């Protein structure tokens, strides 16, 4: 299923930039983002204690 | 512009689930993911060097 996300154009450009910094695809980026996103959130929940 | 990412149902479920753990929308999800992704890598660089 294509994740249809409504993002700003500038923000879209930001995503496009990061996916390109890595050299991967936007799909791979979202895959890595989803995992990094949790690692970050979990780091905040841990640090928040 | 809308991000058109191609994610499997297994992964789509997981993204939508994360967004649901927060209780926010997938728009917010990617907004926060893109920013948290930056801090995630930043936490690896700062620590690494």
Cβ pairs A/B, distance under 8 A: 89
Cα A18 from Cα B16, distance rounded (Å): 22
Among A4, A5, A18, A44, the residue to mutate for chain B (most B Cβ within 10 A): A5
What DSSP designation does A23 have? T
As beta bridge partners, residue A5 has: B3
Cα B32 to Cα A11, A21, A29, A33: the distances in Å are 11, 19, 14, 10
- Return the H-helix or E-strand segment holding B42: helix B26-48
How was this model experimentally determined? NMR
Cα A18 from Cα A21, distance rounded (Å): 5
Tokens of A17: 């930039």
Cα B47 from Cα A14, distance rounded (Å): 24
B5 touches chain A (CB under 8 A): yes
Determine phi and psi for A8, rounding to 5 degrees.
-60, 165
Cα A42 from Cα A14, distance rounded (Å): 24
């Amino acid at each position: 299923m294509k994740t249809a996300i409504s993002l700003p154009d500038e923000t879209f450009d930001r995503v496009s930039r990061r996916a390109s910094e890595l050299g991967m695809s936007r799909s791979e980026f979202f895959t890595k983002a989803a995992q990094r996103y949790l690692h970050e959130l979990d780091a905040q929940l841990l640090t928040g204690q």
